[PDB]
Structure 1
Amino acid sequence: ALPSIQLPVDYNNLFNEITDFLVTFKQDTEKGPKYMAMLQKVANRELNSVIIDLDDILQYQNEKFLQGTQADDLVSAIQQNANHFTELFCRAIDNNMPLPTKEIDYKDDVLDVILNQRRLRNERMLFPPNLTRRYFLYFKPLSQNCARRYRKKAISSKPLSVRQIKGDFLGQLITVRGIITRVSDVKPAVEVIAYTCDQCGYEVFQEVNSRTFTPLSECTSEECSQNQTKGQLFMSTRASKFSAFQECKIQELSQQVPVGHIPRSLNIHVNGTLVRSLSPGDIVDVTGIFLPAPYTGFKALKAGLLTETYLEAQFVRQHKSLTSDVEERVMELITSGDVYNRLAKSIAPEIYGNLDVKKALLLLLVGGVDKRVGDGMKIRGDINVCLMGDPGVAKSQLLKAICKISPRGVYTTGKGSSGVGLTAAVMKDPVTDEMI
């Protein structure tokens, strides 16, 4: 049948150490445990996310080493395998959840009403725990500073590329540096599905751990055990638990591509409160778990043993107003004096000359009055500046440079691409094949 192999890791001692770390850990630098404070904060319906730090876990390991008792190197176990430790930590959080200390505040929560209505009928006359959960659990990659402080090296936070991601890193926690190109809308993904049964017993719950599932449509309760054909199950959306899901694509930076090659791309999946952290056009450093997609359905047979892949995201590090500060900056620049000439001159300091052109580009940067006259008359305040002249006079640096100053600007060129008049009403977007 299925042969058996011996592996050093045992999850019992790991669970014991997680339980010890949640209670014992204190920030050495409020007093007391670091995480039981934020758990109490969560219990008051205020915090929606729980973020664990592996620097903190190393701190607990270092405390135990100061005591001298052996440890299970939890930090390495998390790095090598992280899809199971999420469930372990969720169970550990569920076991030690503090009581609501203040402001219970039950107002109109449908799930709350359902759960409260369950109690009376069940007691007067076991469900999946994830239904009662609200917090989301995320890991935080290691820090080189803390690592160098205690050696031990580091692998999870190293800024790899899309190309350096081999098949040997699957099932681990890694970090990838790139630029975000495409981001999709937020849609709900089912986690626990509740079916209502023709006043037969009560609603049944099923968990979904894949991208594809099958409805139950058969009532198995004790009262529903009667033989008469009676009807299948109907889904109830209100008693079911959903989640926010988003998918993005990250592309390799031009600096890291070798000569003669084409850049690759990677897929990122994000669930929870971390959704909407990434937008198109951002250069970011994303940490997560690298997992194999099932690739099932059609065109799975031809591949046979070939799989897709994706990255479950858990952390985001983006590389890069009226206040008294900006109220004083303008006064400082006024006291500086020579605003006109200096403003014109500092525009593209590489190019020497054409100072009147630089004066006019300033006037183009500012806008004239747009006054809406009655009876339909309108007058424009925008500026139309054309610059003619012989080739090789710095024609096309001046322009590009002006685009930098104003955020709202587009550099459109000749017939290589059609963007000036592309006010088209048809868009064959591959995702859905409908017009936009």
Structure 2
Amino acid sequence: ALPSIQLPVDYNNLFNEITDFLVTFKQDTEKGPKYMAMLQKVANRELNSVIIDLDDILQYQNEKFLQGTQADDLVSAIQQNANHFTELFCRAIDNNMPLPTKEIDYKDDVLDVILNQRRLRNERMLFPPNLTRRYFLYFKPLSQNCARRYRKKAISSKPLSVRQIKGDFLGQLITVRGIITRVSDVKPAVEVIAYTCDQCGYEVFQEVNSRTFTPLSECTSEECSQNQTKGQLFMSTRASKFSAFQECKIQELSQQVPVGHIPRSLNIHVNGTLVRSLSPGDIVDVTGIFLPAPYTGFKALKAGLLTETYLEAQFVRQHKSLTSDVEERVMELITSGDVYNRLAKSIAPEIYGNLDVKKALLLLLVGGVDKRVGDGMKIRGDINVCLMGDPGVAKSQLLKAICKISPRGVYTTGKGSSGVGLTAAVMKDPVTDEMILEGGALVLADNGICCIDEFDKMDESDRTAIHEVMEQQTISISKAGINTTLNARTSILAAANPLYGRYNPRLSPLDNINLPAALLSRFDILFLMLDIPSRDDDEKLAEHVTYVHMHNKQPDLDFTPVEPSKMREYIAYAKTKRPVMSEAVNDYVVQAYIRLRQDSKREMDSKFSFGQATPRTLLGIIRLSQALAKLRLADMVDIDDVEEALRLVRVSKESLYQ
């Protein structure tokens, strides 16, 4: 039949030592046992989880070694095998559960009502213990610090990868380092199922220890022993115990993959209060038990002796507001002074020059006023900045760098992927094969910045969305029978590449690029950065570039790089602020606009300028004054603010020659 083998481990002495450790253990550094305190805390319907530390277990072993009596190295037994010690510890907790000391508080708990109703009828006229349980038991991996303090080495907490997980580590407690890619919704998994039986005896309980089960559907009680055909069992959800279950996939980091290989993936299962600890896009260190999946059902026959695997998770270690602190940070930065120039300069300190562009990127980072006028009129406060110019002028570092500053931002590129206009209504998700409404990148960045690199090569299909956003900021959705309009208020940062190379003495700016005049008119600001050879500038550029290669540090200079978290804190605080205008300030704007138009009537010339001024220019003047006012000022806007905005616009306009 089944042969027998002798193994050193005996579970009786282990159970005795667990019972001794629960009572005796004290924190050496409230007084008394460490865990009977938290058990009493649990009994008062406040704590939902019990977490054991193997450092503490080593402390009990060290205490016993100080006494000198032999031990059973419980820490090694837990590491080698952990699926059984969970049940052992659960039984040990159940045996020594303290009484409720205060605030019994039975209000509307359905399971409580069922259990209380059971008592009267059972006594007047044995169930699975897990039904009465509420706490969840988790283990905590070892610490190298405590290990090095008492040697003994450590295996459970070592940050292995997905690839270093061999088949020799199955059934042990290990830790894996990786990035979370997919997380699923929370669903209930049955643990104890209760069947109601046509007022025959009473409801019956069955435990489920697999992913698949069979209903009972036959009443075996003493009163139900009567021979007449009477009916099968019906399930009752209220008297049954469920649990929260979640499954995730972790993927190997790019640094740890060897050359020529493809990264692998691992599956993680989490049950209990630990659910929702992991989200997509997080680099974490997850500890758990590595167990074999049954792989049954279809396609099991072909494998024969091949199994799946998964990791039952028990611990999570993620690697990486209005308060007086941030109230004082802004005051400190105000007392620092030179906020405008320093804020513009610290943006991408590697790149030397293009300081006006850095001023304009700051105004794009902040947003103008979005005022909802009555009778349906709306006015946009978002910023549309396009940066044109010859190749090899740092076109595509500037952009990427701006994406770092604001959390709400997406870097979308040319026809390699379609994300600008992918407001599709069909999503063939493999998990369920049903449609999901999937928004595009333009919709994704709300109150944010969309960085569209290589805008020249992008197709007219995305041009439709770009045209519509600047008009109404509300994306109409695909024609898959939903008729949905989605909010898409966003600011646009575009990078352009002139047609066939560099700037051309062809006079029309429309000839330099493919973009239509109407599309360019909606842009708030246009910047031309042409590469003109000058003997002085090349020397400083070469020196600046080569200093970075010689020493990895950027070239030290009197200019001080402000700390980036301060950048974010000031930018957010400015964004929260709401300006206001006065009647006197806007009167000078009319004079400015009429002077600009009287210039534009004669400004039509062979080479310089793009068409003529439009009322959209007046709108953008106020829109840009918004950000310059939000930068440091409040309440009414200064008159010199309009001068600053006009100066920035005029420099951008004069960039056509330069």
- TM normalised by structure 1 equals 1.00
| C-alpha distance after superposition, 1:12-34 (max 9, x if no partner) | 00000000000000000000000
2:361 aligned counterpart, secondary structure: helix
Residue 340 (structure 1) shift? 0.0
Q: Distance in 1 between matches of 2:284 and 2:130?
A: 31
Is the partner of 1:370 in helix, strand or coil?
A: coil
Looking at structure 1, the residues matched to 28 and 388 of structure 2 have their Cα atoms a distance apart, in angstroms, of 68
CA distance in 2, matches of 1:397, 1:185: 38
Q: What is the distance in 2 between the residues matched to 1:192 and 1:11? A: 26
Whole-Å Cα distance in 2 between the matches of residues 408 and 53 of structure 1? 40
1:22-77 CA distance string (max 9 Å, x none):
00000000000000000000000000000000000000000000000000000000
Query: What residue number does 1:3 align with?
Result: 3
**Secondary structure class of the residue paired with 1:248:** strand
How far apart are residue 243 of structure 1 and its match?
Answer: 0.0
Per-residue deviation at 1:394?
0.0
Displacement of 1:363 in angstroms is 0.0
Q: Secondary structure at the match of 1:221?
A: coil
CA offset at residue 134 of structure 1?
A: 0.0
Aligned equivalents of 2:152 and 2:185: distance in 1? 40
2:72 paired residue number: 72
Report the Cα offset of residue 330 of structure 1: 0.0
Q: Name the SS for the 2:288 alignment partner.
A: strand
> What is the match of residue 171 of structure 1?
171
Deviations 1:173-226, CA, capped at 9 Å, x for gaps: 000000000000000000000000000000000000000000000000000000
Q: Deviations over 1:141-163 (max 9, x none)?
A: 00000000000000000000000
Whole-angstrom CA distance in 1 between matches of 2:60 and 2:389: 71
Q: Distance in 1 between matches of 2:303 and 2:242?
A: 32
Aligned-partner Cα distance in 2 for 1:92–1:158:
29
Which residue number in structure 2 is paired with residue 331 of structure 1? 331
1:341 aligns to what?
A: 341
Give me the whole-angstrom Cα distance separating, in 1, the residues matched to 2:153 and 2:322. 45
CA distance in 1, matches of 2:360, 2:23: 67
Question: C-alpha distance in 2, partners of 1:304/1:356?
Answer: 69
1:404 and 1:80 map into 2 onto residues whose CA distance is 45
Supply the distance in 2 between the matched residues of 1:359 and 1:292 (Cα, whole angstroms).
Answer: 59
RMSD: 0.0
Size of the aligned set, in residue pairs, is 435
Where 1:386 maps in the other structure, the secondary structure is strand
Q: CA deviation at 1:96?
A: 0.0
| Mapped partners of 1:328, 1:90: distance in 2 | 50
Larger radius of gyration: 2
1:68-126 Cα offsets, whole Å, 9 max, x none, are 00000000000000000000000000000000000000000000000000000000000
Matched residue, 2:409: 409
Deviation per CA, 1:401-423: give whole Å up to 9, x if none.
00000000000000000000000
3-state SS of the aligned residue for 2:60? Answer: helix
| 1:298-317 deviations in Å (ceiling 9; x for gaps) | 00000000000000000000
Superposed displacement of residue 290, structure 1: 0.0
**TM-score, length-scaled by structure 2:** 0.66
Does the residue aligned with 1:330 lie in a helix, a strand or coil?
helix
Q: Which has the higher contact order (CA 8 A, sep 6+)?
A: 1
Distance 1:231 1:192 in 2: 22
Which digits, 9 at most, give the CA deviation of each residue in 1:266-320, with x for residues without a partner? 0000000000000000000000000000000000000000000000000000000
Q: SS state of the match for residue 412, structure 2?
A: coil
What's the offset of the Cα at 1:425?
A: 0.0
Q: Distance in 1 between matches of 2:427 and 2:180?
A: 22
Structure 1 unpaired stretches of 5+: none
1:336 and 1:51 mapped to 2: Cα distance?
A: 48
**Offset, 1:395:** 0.0
Instruction: Return the offset for 1:236.
Output: 0.0
Q: How far is the alpha carbon of 1:129 from its aligned partner?
A: 0.0
The within-5 A match list for 1:52-71 is 52-71=52-71
Aligned mates of 2:320, 2:332 — CA distance in 1 = 27
The CA distance in 2 between the partners of 1:431 and 1:236, in whole Å, is: 29
SS of 1:165's equivalent in the other structure is coil
* Inter-partner Cα distance in structure 1 for 2:237 and 2:34: 37
Q: Secondary structure at the match of 1:316?
A: strand
